[PDB]
Every structure is written in C-alpha cells, then in structure tokens.
C-alpha cells in the first residue's frame, strides 16, 4: 500500500479519523495514518514540520491560517487536480471558504467544512427565571440583562459561557461583537469595538461568566452549559452532537444579539480546509483521499453535526427537533459570516486582538487603550 499521513485536531468521534477508517476499509491500495493535534499546536507543529522536511501528506488547517502556508510554498498547488476531478468542483463551494484556499490565483486546498458561532440557551432555566423561552435576547442590553437574571451562584449557574482565550478562539469569539458595532480587524479600535470590549468587561466584572473565560476553550466552556452550570453559551455547530447526548434540559439556539435594535448581524467564518503539503511523495493518492472526504460531505451534518462548505448540498433536516432547530439557526447566522483575512500574517493580527482582550479584561489597560494598541500593531503587520 501507499501509506499517507494526515494531521487534524478532530477528536476520535469528529469527522477526520472516522472518514479515515472508512477510506482505509476500501482496500484501494492507499492507507492513511492519523495524528491528532491540539488546536493551539496545529500551526506551530505543522510549519516546523514543513521547515524540517517531515510535514505529513495532508492537514486540516484552520481557514485563517491557510494563506500563511500557501504564500510560503508549504502547500501543494491543487489547481490542476481540482480541474480534472469530477468529485470536487469549485462551483460547489461557498465563496468565502473557496477564497480561503486560494493564493496568487491558484488553489492550495479544498474546504473541509464551514461554521460560525451562535447563542445557545437553556429554555428550562429561562422558564425558571420567569423569562420567555420563546423570545431569547435580541440585543446586547437584553443579553446582559438576561445574563444577570440567570446568574445564580447559590445554584452554581453563570448566566453565560463563552471564550476569551488568548488564542485564535478568543479572536474568533470577539470579532462578531466588534463587527456588529461597525469595526473590522483592519479598524479594531472604533468606538463600537470599544463598546463591544466594555460589554465583555461587564460580563466578567459582574461575574455573569466564569473567570475561566479568560483561559478556557469554547469546547470546555460549552461543557459547563451542557452540565447546567451556564444558562447560555456562545459556540459553534461542533457542539451539537455532544449537546444532544449530554444536555439534560430543553434548549434552543438563536442568532447572536446585536448592539442596538436592528443593528447588523455579523460574525466570523469558521472551520477548516484540507491541504496537501508541497513535498508529498504521493500527491495523487493524497488528492484521492480528499476527493473521498468531499464525497461524504452530504452526510456530515447527520453523522457529526458539522456543516459542509458547500452550496450544492443544502443540509436536509435530520428528524431530531433540537438538532434541526440548531441547523436552521447556524445556516442563518452563516449568511452574516465574514472571513478573517486572507492574510499570511493572520497570527500576528490575531495576537494583537488577543492581547487587547486580555489587557482590558484584567484591568491592565482600558478597552480604548487596549484596542488602540492592537490597531497600531495591525496597521504595521497587515
């Protein structure tokens, strides 16, 4: 057999290792060996590996990181293999995910999935507080007010859970708030972005969210929602299948609340892209594996609760009411998602934002000073 290696952060029950097992069972002359990475290590491990001459054949890379690798020659130009493919067609893909694999008018990968974040809420805790579980918060003021009402330390409940972690997750979580208030990563110190960061400060200062928000992943924050220890959660569709299994309460999911009544909805475009490293000894076999993965996209939501990056295969209902309501909401929020970059310098942009978030939330800098500093750094690097 030709043996390929594939690196991804996907957990044992998430798509990649399971797709690999299905592929390997074909006995088609190709086998794939999987290595699970941690979110925080995907970029560092894989660029080091490429630089030292032992990158894997295939990686699932976070979409904002794609341009760094593509621009540095780390990824194989798959333009001609895509053109020849019947399985993979560029017209199948949403424009944002497709653009994220492009560099210099060439394709350097194939989107794996797409996502964004939305607001989960525990309807039983809403009801118990005297709130209307059919009318979740629509505005930031409503969200914060609900979070206050739902914060009940005597019952071990925070009003809300989210992530402000000093990694790409914190940036991914903050950008929607800044963007809804009229900012972008290119202009992250507008008065609206300051208001967004002041609002985060309110959530932490008033103990509406755990202090661990500063250091905890989206996944680990949402585990507290699933356990009934946070009444609301801001997270992605990757939570759905686990939430269905673990959350022992009625819940819903709605669009991210907006800063003023009828202000624009906005969020960041999430999820990963398949890529082949440029010095693979097996470009055809690696591309065949990616074709196989793409061929299974139609079953991604029902099997894993993740969303394809594709307009050709609108996701059908599963038949589970909670899951299908989640689908409707994430499909709607996705319409407002904006790409991070493309930028080969995305990590430096993101680090600037992460540091602003931490500086403001710890009280070391005012939100204004924190974001002014970030904007100055970004102006240089971007």
Query: In sequence order, which residues have a C-beta less than 8 Å from that of residue 253 and are 6 or more positions away?
Result: 118, 119, 120, 121, 325, 326, 329, 330
Rounded Cα–Cα distance for residues 39 and 217 (Å): 9
> What would you report as the CA-atom Rg of the chain, rounded to the nearest whole angstrom?
21
Here the contacts of 24-32 (C-beta below 8 Å, separation 24 or greater) are: 26/292, 28/288, 29/1, 29/2, 30/1, 30/2, 30/3, 30/4, 30/282, 30/285, 30/288, 30/289, 31/1, 31/2, 31/3, 31/4, 32/3, 32/4, 32/5, 32/6, 32/58, 32/289
Which part of the chain is CATH 3.40.190.10? 1-116+267-341, 117-266+342-382
DSSP result, 14-30: SHHHHHHHHHHHT-SSE
Q: Which two structure tokens, joined as six digits, stand for 5?
A: 């290696």
**Alpha helix positions (H), the chain:** 15-25, 42-52, 66-71, 79-84, 95-100, 123-128, 140-150, 168-180, 191-205, 218-226, 240-246, 283-295, 300-304, 321-334, 346-361, 367-381
- Given a contact cutoff of 8 angstroms between Cβ atoms, the answer to whether 181 and 120 are in contact is no
Q: Write the CA distances from 295 to 41, 87, 235, 363, 371, integer angstroms.
A: 28, 7, 27, 50, 43
Specify the pairing of strand 2-8 against strand 30-36: parallel
Helices (H) and strands (E) in the chain, counts: 16, 12
CA 160 to chain centroid = 19
Specify the pairing of strand 232-235 against strand 251-254: unpaired
Sign of CA dihedral 293, 238, 249, 217: positive
- Given a contact cutoff of 8 angstroms between Cβ atoms, the answer to whether 81 and 110 are in contact is no
Q: Write the CA distances from 378 to 32, 161, 164, 348, 366, integer angstroms.
A: 39, 28, 19, 8, 18
The highest-level CATH class for domain 1-116+267-341 is alpha beta
Rounded to 5 degrees, what angle do the CA atoms 174, 165, 238 make?
Answer: 75
Rounded Cα–Cα distance for residues 175 and 196 (Å): 9
| CATH code reported for the domain at 117-266+342-382 | 3.40.190.10
Q: Name the residue among 211, 212, 240 with its Cα closest to residue 226.
A: 240
Q: Which two structure tokens, joined as six digits, stand for 360?
A: 């403001």
Rounded to 5 degrees, what angle do the CA atoms 6, 12, 15 make?
Answer: 65
Q: Classify 71 in phi/psi space as left (phi over 0), alpha (psi -120 to 50) or beta.
A: alpha
């Amino acid at each position: 057999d030709v043996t390929l290696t594939l690196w991804s952060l996907d957990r044992d029950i998430q798509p990649a290792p399971n797709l690999i097992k299905e592929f390997n069972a074909l006995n088609n002359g190709i086998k794939i060996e999987y290595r699970q990475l941690q979110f925080d290590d995907v970029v560092s491990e894989s660029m080091r590996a490429y630089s030292t001459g032992n990158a894997p054949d295939i990686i699932a890379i976070d979409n904002p990181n794609h341009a760094m690798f593509a621009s540095r020659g780390a990824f194989l130009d798959v333009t001609d293999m895509i053109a020849k493919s019947d399985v993979i067609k560029t017209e199948n893909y949403f424009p944002g995910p497709l653009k994220s694999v492009t560099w210099d008018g060439k394709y350097f990968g194939v989107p794996k999935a797409t996502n964004t974040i939305a607001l989960y809420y525990n309807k039983d805790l809403f009801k118990a507080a005297g709130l209307d579980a059919a009318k979740p918060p629509q505005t930031w003021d409503e969200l914060v007010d609900a979070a206050r009402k739902l914060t009940n330390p005597a019952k071990n409940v925070y009003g809300i859970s989210f992530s402000a972690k000093a990694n790409e997750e914190g940036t991914f979580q903050f950008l929607p708030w800044a963007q809804m208030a009229g900012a972008t990563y290119k202009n992250i110190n507008t008065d609206g972005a300051v208001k967004a960061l002041e609002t985060w400060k309110t959530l932490l200062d008033e103990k509406l969210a755990s202090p661990d928000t500063l250091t905890r992943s989206q996944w680990d924050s949402t585990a507290t929602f699933n356990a009934g220890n946070a009444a609301m959660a801001i997270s992605g569709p990757w939570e759905i299948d686990r939430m269905l299994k673990d959350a022992k309460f009625d819940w819903g999911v709605t669009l991210l609340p907006v800063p003023t009544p009828d202000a624009p909805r906005s969020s960041a475009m999430g999820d990963y892209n398949w890529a082949i490293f440029s010095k693979t000894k097996h470009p055809a076999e690696a591309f065949k594996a990616i074709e196989f993965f793409a061929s299974k996209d139609k079953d991604m939501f029902k099997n894993f609760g993740q969303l394809p990056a594709r307009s050709d295969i609108p996701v059908p209902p599963t038949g589970n009411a909670l899951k299908d309501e989640a689908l409707k909401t994430f499909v709607e929020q996705l319409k407002y998602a904006q790409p991070r970059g493309p930028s080969p310098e995305w990590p430096k942009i993101s680090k600037a934002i992460q540091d602003a978030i931490q500086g403001a939330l710890s009280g070391q800098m005012t939100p204004k000073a924190a974001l002014d500093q970030a904007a100055e750094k970004i102006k240089l690097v971007d």
